[PDB]
């Protein structure tokens, strides 16, 4: 009877549908958002920076590998 459920690092709640593995954790596909505007990537692409998510523009606005 070992555990068997991811937990959204956003609300620390047991996820149960589609999980997002980021920050070396798990996030509700609905709570995984940019770390600057909070825009969830339900079905979009996200960007990571310093260990934090960022939209395509905020990530870049924040850095953009440049
Ligand atoms: Zn969550
Ligand atoms: Zn953003």
UniProtKB/Swiss-Prot annotation:
Residues 8-58 form the LIM zinc-binding domain. Coiled coil: none annotated. It comes from the Eukaryota. It is found in: Cell junction, Focal adhesion; Cell membrane. Expressed in most tissues except in the brain. Within the IPP (ILK-PINCH-PARVIN) complex, binds to F-actin, promoting F-actin bundling, a process required to generate force for actin cytoskeleton reorganization and subsequent dynamic cell adhesion events such as cell spreading and migration. Component of the heterotrimeric IPP (ILK-PINCH-PARVIN) complex composed of ILK, LIMS1/PINCH and PARVA; the complex binds to F-actin via the C-terminal tail of LIMS1 and the N-terminal region of PARVA, promoting F-actin filament bundling. Formation of the IPP complex is dependent on protein kinase C and precedes integrin-mediated cell adhesion and spreading. Competes with LIMS2 for interaction with ILK. Interacts (via LIM zinc-binding 5) with TGFB1I1. Interacts with SH3/SH2 adapter NCK2, thereby linking the complex to cell surface receptors. This is LIM and senescent cell antigen-like-containing domain protein 1. It comes from Homo sapiens (Human). The lineage of its organism: Eukaryota, Metazoa, Chordata, Craniata, Vertebrata. The chain holds residues 188 to 251 of 325 of the full protein.
């Amino acid at each position: 009877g070992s555990m068997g459920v991811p937990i959204c690092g956003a609300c620390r709640r047991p996820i149960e549908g589609r999980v997002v593995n980021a920050m070396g954790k798990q996030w509700h596909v609905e709570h995984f958002v940019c770390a600057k505007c909070e825009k969830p990537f339900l079905g979009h692409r996200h960007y990571e920076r310093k260990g934090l998510a960022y939209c395509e523009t905020h990530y870049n606005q924040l850095f953009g590998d440049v």
